[PDB]
Amino acid sequence: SSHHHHHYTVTVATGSQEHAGTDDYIYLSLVGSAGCSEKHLLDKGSFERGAVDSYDVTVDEELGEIQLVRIEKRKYGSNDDWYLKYITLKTPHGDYIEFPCYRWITGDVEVVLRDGRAKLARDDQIHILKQHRRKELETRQKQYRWMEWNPGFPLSIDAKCHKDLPRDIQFDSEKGVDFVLNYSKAMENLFINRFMHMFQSSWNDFADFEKIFVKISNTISERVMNHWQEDLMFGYQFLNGANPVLIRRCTELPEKLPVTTEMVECSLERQLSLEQEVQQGNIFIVDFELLDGIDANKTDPCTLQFLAAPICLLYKNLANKIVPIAIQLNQIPGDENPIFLPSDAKYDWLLAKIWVRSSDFHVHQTITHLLRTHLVSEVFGIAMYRQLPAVHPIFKLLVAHVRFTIAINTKAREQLICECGLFDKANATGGGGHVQMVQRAMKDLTYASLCFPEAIKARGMESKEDIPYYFYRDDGLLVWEAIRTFTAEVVDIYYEGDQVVEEDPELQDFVNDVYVYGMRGRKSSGFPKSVKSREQLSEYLTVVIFTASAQHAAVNFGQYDWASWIPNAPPTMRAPPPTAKGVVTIEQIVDTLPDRGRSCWHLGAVWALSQFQENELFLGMYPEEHFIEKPVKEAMARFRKNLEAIVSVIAERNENLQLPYYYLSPDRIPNSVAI
Ligand SMILES: [Fe+2]
């Protein structure tokens, strides 16, 4: 695809996208320490998609060391956008200089690119480079401003629809990544259009839903189908499901749950008492205080949707497996909030489990998944684009991990979770309830909650010896330390010491745009207002990236496996929680379960949101060479080797498991949060 033009040897790399070529005029200038260059007109032929064009440009006079490159595109007619990858120069004196672009040029502005050697402001001392940097930040801050989408929410990009973002942060495709289009296209692909708007109609039994499900089911999905009524599967999801972040070891029984040793005698397997067992550390808890006060979806007057705020008490049996031993569906005990038990009627216990699952699904969708992953990543991205110039070593590193984050969130807000959005179709927290969740969850979000080892230890889930079957933790720690090592290497490459980090003005303003605008300047978040050490900078970028890639994928890509069997992850409930024991029948649960119309939308949503791209970039795949220097390439190479080793470790582990756990295998962890 190489084309040579003959009258400095200039090589321009055009993008591989479906539209990266442009037929407009492209003029080029070389800005040197001893002079500037005329606007040289490139070939008249249109730059092609995936192209690499070479041109001979003769300078009238010695320009000295080439520092900057101006690129202008003037429309020949009907101006179309052009994705520039990089520009290489082979100078007369025998020097090869690479300028990474990787940006959309739509004629609107003249783009100015700098050498691919990563630089800190402290390194720049001449008017040429400094003016470029200052002006670059001026326009970055003109282009990337903050906005509050909903009160108490983290600040997001200033835009109403997708087309309102800078194209550099838009999707490569016009309508390529669309919630409406991909969800409906799945509902057709999954062969479920007949139920797309078939509300107020209930599935007559499990068998009917099962016959449609077998043809679309997966491995983990079919296991869920065969084992969703088992205490073992119920407890297993609390460690290795799609939302394995809520369980905490119980060191003292909550006073609000008046559970008794005599109540759990049958589940207990050590001849110890319930309190004695808590003293031993074998009792675990999942408390849904965050669902108390959430308003259920009232958008459908012909169906009442209901939430709960359960407290689930679980036990680690002689097999070192965590299984549920007690469930109270609401927060304040009484005569109408029974504590259901595995000894109760089959369907009392089953309905308790169904409600616990529904609550976990609501938390996952809103708190675990959206807020703590997407919106955090978007905050980091907006701060990045505002405060770190493209020549900064932190920008070159994070740009690949915040790719498609702003755009996916904006598309969500314009199609998915807006007022009367697709979210309200099947979820009971539509109409505003989920909004309140985020607000209430905000004050619980802290910088330590995003640091993985601290987060694991904070709930007491640290000991692999006492809690051996926590694969999510085991893989997460491997990946976290891998990324920490990679980030440490980069930091050490670019910061002589803590003084250089501390004196870095653009890093500090980036951190502060995260603290003030991202977290709203809330003191109780724990976010650094300034980084003064390389260990702290490493940890900060580690939080950023791990939230943007590994954690996000762990919370997203278990949705079709585990939520696909609706009884295992109900998006809504159509009856209030049972207030008495021995009064509920399997039929009544089927009637409490979602209708046929919401079924299709939930299934399509989890399937569409559970998808990898055909040419997706996984952890370490950095095709866009923003870094072009040798030491940083070696650091990336080591990153890749350690990741591949972890892939081997995780595969060998999966070979000996009932149900393998592949979500934290780096070969399935994208770079950024694109869904
Ligand atoms: Fe996600």
Swiss-Prot record:
EC assignment: 1.13.11.-, 1.13.11.34
Cofactor(s) this protein requires: Fe cation
Effect of residue 448 to S: Increases arachidonate 5-lipoxygenase activity
Superkingdom per UniProt: Eukaryota
Regulation: Undergoes a sequential loss of the oxygenase and pseudoperoxidase activities which is dependent on the structural characteristics of the substrate for the reaction, on oxygen concentration and on exposure to phospholipids and calcium. 15-HETE and other 15-mono-hydroxyeicosanoids exhibit the highest inhibitory potencies in their capability of suppressing 5-lipoxygenation of arachidonic acid, whereas the other HETEs, (5S,15S)-dihydroxy-(6E,8Z,11Z,13E)-eicosatetraenoic acid (5,15-diHETE) as well as octadecanoids, are modest or poor inhibitors.
Reported impact of residue 592 to M: Increases arachidonate 5-lipoxygenase activity. Does not affect leukotriene A4 synthase activity
Pathway this chain belongs to: Lipid metabolism; leukotriene A4 biosynthesis
UniProt PTM comment: Serine phosphorylation by MAPKAPK2 is stimulated by arachidonic acid. Phosphorylation on Ser-525 by PKA has an inhibitory effect. Phosphorylation on Ser-273 prevents export from the nucleus. Phosphorylation at Ser-525 is stimulated by 8-bromo-3',5'-cyclic AMP or prostaglandin E2.
Residue ranges occupied by any Lipoxygenase domain in the UniProt entry: 120-675
Residues given in the record as Ca(2+) 1 binding sites: 21, 80-81
Domain PLAT: 8-119
Gene3D superfamilies: 3.10.450.60, Lipoxygenase-1, Domain 5, PLAT/LH2 domain
Impact upon substituting residue 338 to S: Decreases arachidonate 5-lipoxygenase activity
Keyword Membrane: yes
Gene Ontology MF, one: arachidonate 8(S)-lipoxygenase activity
Phosphoserine: modified positions: 273, 525
Keywords: Calcium, Cytoplasm, Dioxygenase, Hydrolase, Iron, Leukotriene biosynthesis, Lipid metabolism, Membrane, Metal-binding, Nucleus, Oxidoreductase, Phosphoprotein
Gene Ontology CC annotation, any one: extracellular space
PANTHER family from the UniProt entry: LIPOXYGENASE
Role summary: Catalyzes the oxygenation of arachidonate ((5Z,8Z,11Z,14Z)-eicosatetraenoate) to 5-hydroperoxyeicosatetraenoate (5-HPETE) followed by the dehydration to 5,6- epoxyeicosatetraenoate (Leukotriene A4/LTA4), the first two steps in the biosynthesis of leukotrienes, which are potent mediators of inflammation. Also catalyzes the oxygenation of arachidonate into 8-hydroperoxyicosatetraenoate (8-HPETE) and 12-hydroperoxyicosatetraenoate (12-HPETE). Displays lipoxin synthase activity being able to convert (15S)-HETE into a conjugate tetraene.
Family: Belongs to the lipoxygenase family.
Subunit structure: Homodimer. Interacts with ALOX5AP and LTC4S. Interacts with COTL1, the interaction is required for stability and efficient catalytic activity. Interacts with PIK3R1; this interaction bridges ALOX5 with CD40 after CD40 ligation in B cells and leads to the production of reactive oxygen species (ROS). Interacts (via PLAT domain) with DICER1 (via Dicer dsRNA-binding fold domain); this interaction enhances arachidonate 5-lipoxygenase activity and modifies the miRNA precursor processing activity of DICER1.
The protein's name: Polyunsaturated fatty acid 5-lipoxygenase
Species assigned in the record: Homo sapiens (Human)
